[model samples]
Target: MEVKELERDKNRVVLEYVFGAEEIAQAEDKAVRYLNQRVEIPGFRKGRIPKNVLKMKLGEEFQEYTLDFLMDLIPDTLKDRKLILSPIVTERELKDVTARVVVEVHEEP
Candidate 1:
């Protein structure tokens, strides 16, 4: 089993299994929201800071934290949905500036 990009007309593909910027974005959003809600910054209301502001102020140092949060969530989402992915986990690609996620899950045993 392998995960790849979408072909022209394969209907049986498992898309979400692929890795892409969307997932990373989701993770980042979750992290930012989490920090916004939990951490208190001077002169700002609780969880009120704009995402860009937060990212810039934090200097993107917190991206790793965001990834941590994402890692925790995505796998559980998949497992809870019983979407045990195929064996060959290959590379994934997603849009960093959009909400599209595309992945290729190949044949399984």
Candidate 2:
């Protein structure tokens, strides 16, 4: 499991998990689709930029934004799964501007 600290001063931590081949594909698909709608691409209509363009132009921001989108819905996903992540992982990038993060979570032992 890959883990990164979101903010040391804020006590935020991000956990990085690798999805399997199929899962990775699914995550990438959804990540791209959701970001496409919310991201702003230069000279392109919202959500109209081609995947290749997005990957090229806003690749970094796209990843961080996708994580934001993912974290927003994680609570619902957790409810459905009935699983708990203690000291919940908050997403953060290491030397990568195109980072992802959960931002914050309830800290518990």
Candidate 3:
């Protein structure tokens, strides 16, 4: 994966993240609100289960909840840099997603 530079300055810099479908798919596993709104037990409702029990009872593949709601991803991909402006998705598709975010940078003295 390559990060493309679009905007830059002394105090901050802007970057574009081009994450492929496979990359997003891999990040999906980091969701904690996992299957909380999907699973329906005999005595419990959809959102009335313990975190540990949900993981144990609903033992299977991870759920395809969402990118922002169910899980926060992509931005942290470049979290090594401090955030300036959290860019929204300028382009989104099943093939890939493009987001532009600004990060703070240090200048030479």
lDDT tens digits by residue: candidate 2, 13-94: 3435432345334545676787677878679788876766766777567666555544444454345443345336444432
Q: Rate the local accuracy (lDDT) of all candidates.
A: 0.60, 0.54, 0.54
Candidate number of the best lDDT: 1
Q: What tens-digit string does per-residue lDDT give for candidate 1 at 1-109?
A: 1233455354344433444566677777887878887888888898888778877887746676665664464454445444345323333332334376789998988
Candidate 3 lDDT, 1-109, residue by residue in tens? 4468787798566556655556555555434444555666776667666655654654543333334432345666667867677755554333234688999999998
TM per prediction: 0.49, 0.42, 0.36
As for candidate 3, its clashing pairs are: none
Model 1: CA > 4 A from native: 1-18, 77-109
What is the Cα-based lDDT of residue 20 in candidate 3? 55
Q: Which residue segments of model 3 deviate by more than 4 Å? A: 31-33, 37-65, 69-109
